[PDB]
């Protein structure tokens, strides 16, 4: 998602499903309902 | 900011946006018409 060479246009923005995996957010910022430093 | 990823010396045309519409979108609703 982050290192893709081209990004979709905003009018046709891309949506991707994340499923069945370990989300490591240290590899990565306004968060609503949550704090990024706790996202792990 | 993606300047040294997307900036073009001529004007990029790969990123479009809807500048006119009937009514404002509903949350998480896409319009590719």
């Amino acid at each position: 998602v982050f290192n893709a060479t081209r990004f979709a246009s905003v009018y046709a923005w891309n949506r991707k499903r994340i499923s069945n995996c370990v989300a490591d957010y240290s590899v990565l910022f306004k968060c609503y309902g949550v704090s990024p430093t706790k996202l792990n | 900011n993606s300047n040294k990823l997307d900036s073009k010396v001529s004007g990029n045309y790969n990123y479009l946006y809807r500048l006119f519409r009937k009514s404002n979108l509903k949350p998480f609703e896409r319009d590719i018409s």
């Binding site: 893709a4 060479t5 081209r6 | 300047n3 040294k4 990823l5 997307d6 900036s7 073009k8 010396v9 001529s10 990029n12 045309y13 790969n14």
Partner: peptide
């Protein structure tokens, strides 16, 4: 990934090598 590259990607070839997707990457070409 042939489609996501320039030989532009959208021809602005048969999507179905420059570092960047097309010319608009005129800092990493």
């Amino acid at each position: 990934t042939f489609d996501d590259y320039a030989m532009s990607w959208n021809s602005g070839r048969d999507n179905a090598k420059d570092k960047t997707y097309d010319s608009p990457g005129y800092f990493l070409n």
